[PDB]
Amino acid sequence: GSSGSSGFLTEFINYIKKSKVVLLEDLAFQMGLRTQDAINRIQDLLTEGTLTGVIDDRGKFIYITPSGPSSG
């Protein structure tokens, strides 16, 4: 359990799970943050494994989460 002003990370991840299709360009717009900033966070989380996804030649983010059983 992370301590301090930790919340944007937890809320950001939860949003991705629910969100079927999330774009990096749109992500920064909705969150206000910059595209590069948003991408950096996604790449970091995906690198550690915290999140699993793939990027296409269109620099788009595609998350594939199992609908229904939220256990693992």
**For the chain, domain boundaries:** 7-64
Least Cα distance to 51 among 5, 10, 3, 1 occurs for: 10
What's the sign of the alpha-carbon dihedral 62, 17, 23, 39?
negative
* Technique used by the depositors: NMR
In this structure, the dihedral spanned by the alpha carbons of residues 23, 25, 26 and 27, taken in order and rounded to 10 degrees, is 80
Q: What would be the CATH architecture of the domain defined by 7-64?
A: Orthogonal Bundle (1.10)
Distance of CA 9 to the CA centre of its chain: 9
Give the three-state DSSP class for 71: coil
Those residues whose C-beta lies under 8 Å from the C-beta of residue 39, and which sit 6 or more positions away, are 24, 59
SS3 55: strand
State the DSSP code for 51.
S
What are the backbone dihedrals phi and psi of residue 23, each rounded to the nearest 5 degrees, phi first?
Answer: -100, 145
The Cβ of residue 39 has, within 10 Å, a number of other Cβ atoms equal to 18
Task: Quote the CA–CA distance of 72 and 61 in Å, as a whole number.
Answer: 22
DSSP state of 50: S
CB 53 within 8 A of CB 64: yes
